[PDB]
Paper text:
Complex I couples the transfer of two electrons from NADH to ubiquinone (Q) with the translocation of four protons across the membrane. The L-shaped complex is structured into a peripheral arm that protrudes into the aqueous milieu and catalyzes electron transfer with one FMN and 8–10 iron–sulfur ([Fe–S]) clusters, and a membrane arm embedded in the lipid bilayer that mediates proton translocation. We have determined structures of the electron-input module of complex I from the hyperthermophilic bacterium Aquifex aeolicus, encompassing subunits NuoE and NuoF that contain the FMN cofactor, the [4Fe–4S] cluster N3, and the [2Fe–2S] cluster N1a, respectively, both in the air-oxidized and dithionite-reduced states at resolutions up to 1.8 Å. Here, we show that the redox state of N1a regulates NADH oxidation in complex I by inducing a conformational change close to the NADH-binding site.
To determine the mode of nucleotide binding, crystals of NuoEF were soaked with NAD+, with NADH and with NADH plus dithionite, leading to refined models at 2.0, 1.8, and 1.9 Å resolution, respectively. The structures of NADH and NADH plus dithionite-reduced NuoEF were virtually identical. Noteworthy, in the NAD+-bound state, the peptide bond between E95F and S96F faces the FMN as in the oxidized protein without nucleotide, while in the NADH-bound state, the peptide bond is pointing toward the loop coordinating N1a as it is in the structure of the reduced protein without nucleotide. Remarkably, the reduced nicotinamide group penetrates significantly deeper into the binding pocket than its oxidized form placing it in an optimal position for hydride transfer. The amide carbon atom protrudes 1.65 Å deeper into the binding pocket changing its distance to the Cα carbon atom of Glu95F from 5.37 Å to 4.03 Å. The two positions of the nicotinamide in the binding pocket are here called tight (NADH in reduced NuoEF) and loose (NAD+ in oxidized NuoEF). Water molecules that are here resolved for the first time play an important role in substrate binding by forming hydrogen bonds between NADH and NuoF. The E97F side chain binds the NO2' of NADH by a connecting water molecule. One water molecule bridges the backbone amide of G394F and the side chain of E184F with the NO1 of NADH. In NuoEF, the carbonyl group faces cluster N1a in the reduced state enabling binding of the nicotinamide in the tight position.
Numbering used by the authors:
A (entry chain B): 2 to 418
B (entry chain A): 6 to 160
The structure:
């Protein structure tokens, strides 16, 4: 009943799907959820074969909401081609700067996530599922534990669920400070009771994951879509947004906007529409300088008319929109991005370990005007050399946003020289 | 060293929760830090035995996970987000306000061992920047008068 204090993040929807309940900043318990027809998609799914559910999730065109956009049906298909036992993992590590879309599902509509996990686990033949939630989401952790007990009490979990013969237990694990533990193989190691160190891929978790068994790892938002695909059928789900990038999408908008918060919109919405049509424009009506897609990409004011989809020219990523205005120093902002990667590298790979450290250390010198000419040259080189030999996406992107600021805002970097 | 019954019962609960005992390490350590206000170096050996893991394994886990502090005892941990959105919206104003109220800077502990400022990476509440946590509770910093009132709730 009593949970730790959680800020009341503003949430607005045009689709009334993922935020049907989560648009209200409060826990929605099982009675409230059931009144909205909750757990009926699970009932329908338990009367379908695991194979039909995979086919439906495939045909819906649902792509991973964690940031990489891998087709969900396709992922499940790879796992089920491998013998059992299989494991299902809900990734609730959400630690990307500017990213707060998942937590509002967890904290306000936990039964939407739970129902999605049960359908997904049934579809892949997993009798054991996990929620790995970042340690900095303690309220989300107690909210999920309470909602899981409510589901067990209503017979949605445990042995022979609703007389289907399908068994399922959901275990909630907590992270403990590491951004890298959201990387799906580091998450699996942490779930195994070890340090959050990413594994060399391939194998992908679907071939060899938790305890070396076929494992599906899906983001909170991806899983929250599964009850909607089953409830409305894949065809009606595909009517939402463009047919090539279908369904609802959560957009966590922050920074220099009048209305920061989470927006549920179709993926054909443009970045400019997200800021100006939905987030109320900029604070003080000051000109947009840049948009940071988390700690992954940097878009200039010349790139605002792009769609918020998984297309090559689209925004992509998690859909995270951090708005910087004309008075925000791009180098000071780049320093914040460099400091993030410095703090989060697991240090397994030498160029990532040294590269993340040096990029932040040299960028600080540059910013403070204490950099030598060799420091400027070393900084340029280290930034273009974090990726070599990396075994996870962190080393591959630790220099991406910063390089884009160098290319898109050369005038500002030039004054720091 | 022996864990108090009230804590030992909570640790046994986390250990019997997951299908394998070793899967409970992080939940056990969070519980140890909640109880003591830090990770006492002495607690690691009985925990390793309860998890059926070697001490070296437990030591490496404690070293890896940044939420765990085996150095400073503190009743209340003020986690201050130092990442990009919060820096843009006023981390420095929040840290200035904290220095004025408690007399401490990040990484420091108040003389009475009541409060410790812990600088942290993005806390996933960026629309509410600048964000801070006081143990498990999370808030948007508004001003010094406002922060003063929040901190007064922690006795
Ligand atoms: N949401 C957050 O808080 C957060 C934080 C940090 C990073 N990220 C995101 O993480 C993304 C990178 O993730 P990644 O390294 O997992 O990316 P990825 O493109 O390599 O893979 C995405 C998913 O598809 C699966 N997959 C890919 N190829 C496969 C294949 N051949 N066979 C089977 N499965 C396959 C992977 O196992 C994974 O589950 C970034 O775009 C970033 O936005 C998100
Ligand atoms: C360093 C790093 C951190 C990641 N953190 C997260 C995270 O917090 N949440 C998430 O769902 N995916 C995260 N990912 C992506 C996962 O590895 C993976 O792609 C995803 O969980 C699969 O789910 P999806 O297909 O539903 O998106 C991270 C990737 C990397 C490289
Ligand atoms: S690229 Fe960096 S974060 Fe990823 S496994 Fe290598 S050292 Fe660790
Ligand atoms: S940058 Fe501080 S909460 Fe995200
Ligand atoms: Na984590």
């Amino acid at each position: 009943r009593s949970y730790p204090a959680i800020p009341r993040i503003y949430a607005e929807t045009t689709l009334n799907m993922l935020l049907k309940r989560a648009k209200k900043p409060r826990v929605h318990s099982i009675d409230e959820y059931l009144k909205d027809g909750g757990y009926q998609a699970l009932e329908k799914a338990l009367n379908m074969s695991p194979e039909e559910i995979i086919d439906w999730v495939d045909k819906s065109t649902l792509r991973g909401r964690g940031g990489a956009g891998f087709p969900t049906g396709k992922k499940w298909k790879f796992a089920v081609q491998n013998p059992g036992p299989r494991y299902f993992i809900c990734n609730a590590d959400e630690s990307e700067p500017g990213t707060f879309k998942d937590r509002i599902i967890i904290e306000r509509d936990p039964h939407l996530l739970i129902e999605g996990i049960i359908i997904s686990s049934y579809a892949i033949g997993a009798n054991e599922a996990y929620i790995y939630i970042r340690g900095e989401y303690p309220a989300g952790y107690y909210i999920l534990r309470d909602a899981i007990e409510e589901a067990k009490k209503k017979g949605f979990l445990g042995k022979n669920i609703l007389g289907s013969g399908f068994d399922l237990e959901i275990y909630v694990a907590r992270g403990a400070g590491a951004y890298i533990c959201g990387e799906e193989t580091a998450l699996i190691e942490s779930l195994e009771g070890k340090r959050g160190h990413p594994r060399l891929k391939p194998p992908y978790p679907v071939q060899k994951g938790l305890w070396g068994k076929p494992t599906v790892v899906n983001n909170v938002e991806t899983i929250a879509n599964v009850p909607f695909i089953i409830s409305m059928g894949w065809e009606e789900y595909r009517y939402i947004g463009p047919s090539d990038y279908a369904g609802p999408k959560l957009f966590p908008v922050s920074g220099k906007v009048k209305k920061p918060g989470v927006y549920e919109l179709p993926m054909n919405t443009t970045l400019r529409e997200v800021i100006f049509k939905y987030a109320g424009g900029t604070l003080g009506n000051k000109k947009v300088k840049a948009v940071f897609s988390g700690a992954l990409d940097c878009f200039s004011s010349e790139e605002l008319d792009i769609p918020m989809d998984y297309s090559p020219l689209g925004f992509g990523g998690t859909g995270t929109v951090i708005v910087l205005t004309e008075e925000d120093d791009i180098v000071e902002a780049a320093l914040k991005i460099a400091e993030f990667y410095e703090h989060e590298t697991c240090g397994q790979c030498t160029p990532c370990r040294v590269g993340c450290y040096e990029q932040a250390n040299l960028l600080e010198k540059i910013y403070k005007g204490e950099a030598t000419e060799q420091d400027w040259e070393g900084f340029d080189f280290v930034n273009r050399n974090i990726q070599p030999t990396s075994i996870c996406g962190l080393g591959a992107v630790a220099g991406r946003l910063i390089r884009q600021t160098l290319e898109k805002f050369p005038e500002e970097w030039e004054k720091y020289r | 060293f022996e864990f108090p019954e009230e804590l030992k019962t909570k640790l046994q609960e986390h250990i019997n929760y997951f299908p394998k005992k070793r899967q409970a390490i992080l939940l056990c350590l969070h519980e140890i830090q909640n109880y003591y206000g830090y990770i006492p170096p002495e607690s690691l050996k009985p925990l390793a035995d309860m998890l059926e893991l070697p001490l070296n394994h437990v030591e490496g886990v404690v070293a890896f996970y940044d939420m765990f502090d085996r150095e400073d005892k503190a009743k209340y941990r003020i986690r201050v987000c130092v990442s990009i959105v919060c820096h843009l919206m006023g981390t420095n104003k929040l840290l200035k306000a904290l220095e004025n109220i408690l007399g401490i800077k990040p990484g420091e502990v108040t003389p009475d061992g009541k409060f410790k400022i812990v600088p942290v990476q993005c806390l996933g509440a960026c629309s509410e920047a600048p964000v801070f946590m006081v143990n498990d509770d999370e808030y948007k910093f508004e001003s010094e008068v406002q922060l003063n009132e929040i901190l007064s709730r922690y006795t």
